[PDB]
Amino acid sequence: GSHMNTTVSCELHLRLVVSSESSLPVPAGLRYDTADPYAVHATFHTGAEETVEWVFARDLLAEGLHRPTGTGDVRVWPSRSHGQGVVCIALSSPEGEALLEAPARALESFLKRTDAAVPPGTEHRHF
Amino acid sequence: GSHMNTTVSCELHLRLVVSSESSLPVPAGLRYDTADPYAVHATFHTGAEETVEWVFARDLLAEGLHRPTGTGDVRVWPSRSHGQGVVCIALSSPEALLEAPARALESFLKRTDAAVPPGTEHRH
Amino acid sequence: GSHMNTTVSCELHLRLVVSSESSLPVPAGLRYDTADPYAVHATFHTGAEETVEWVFARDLLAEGLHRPTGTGDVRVWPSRSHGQGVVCIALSSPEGEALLEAPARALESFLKRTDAAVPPGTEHRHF
């Protein structure tokens, strides 16, 4: 008998930025697992019975609330839209390039709950 | 940051063929994961708080829409029942006969093919 | 195609024993997988969008209905509280020490369903 994992989750409503004047709604689930303490797992509901799963560095999403960050597949930066603070998530794959807007307040509140489970700087205690 | 997986799923109502006289309803989930691109995962809801999980070759379900196929644990073949096309799924472990509605099965496989065309699985 | 797994599950209501006179409700999901025939997986719903996952030896929970058992992370023993038979579950991790009360009848009824799927003594047939 042993403690395998603690999970912190939330549901966010993201916007897929199609154009300057057009966006599509993308419900997303975020999960944090204390057994994988550097990571955040994201499920993007891109269709009724379709999902796309991405893994992010928790520290990249945390930094993305305050300043532009990331190289390679993922670029993150803060901004505002429709009178809300947002985190912009630019994703590159073999398939192509997508731009998503996450509500900053909801993202930050989820990261604060992950910090209560595993304070940043203590991830190594779990490995 | 990295793309771990794309999932395509559907919910089917299958018929457990108990006998010629009587059959039972089995709600099932099918899921295709591009991280496991040769496979289809099936969850058979056999009881209120009970499931049976099977893994199939995608290509076996795809072939089963058109002709009889499989040896060992799984045999699949097309047929008709109550005026609908069905795929018959015979499963052996240490035996169950299931009927899947062909249209719904085929439309799920076509969505998996749009994500990963058969023949390209190895690119993933 | 291969028959990966058969799952037997139940939802129980456990009491987290905070104090002599104070307890908190912990909804818990128990899952038995015939592909992992020695184990019971427990999900403790400790808040709206947080869970704590534990693995137990099925045989430890089974023994815990009848007598005190376990060394290390998990200690289990039968008892009574508010006139109902309970199994006491004491859990230790680097993170936490917890005392939980499970209703004995409901726990036993779940284990009997796992025994109908994989009778104790036959776990090895699955490997």
Numbering used by the authors:
A (entry chain BBB), C (entry chain AAA): -2 to 124
B (entry chain CCC): -2 to 91, 94 to 123
Question: What text appears in the publication on this structure?
Answer:
In the filamentous bacterium Streptomyces, cell division is positively controlled by SsgB, which recruits FtsZ to the future septum sites and promotes Z-ring formation. Instead, a positive control system has evolved, whereby FtsZ is actively recruited to the septum sites by SsgB, in concert with its paralogue SsgA. SsgB is the archetypical SALP, with a conserved function in the development of actinomycetes. The SsgA-like proteins (SALPs) are a family of regulatory proteins that is unique in sporulating actinobacteria.
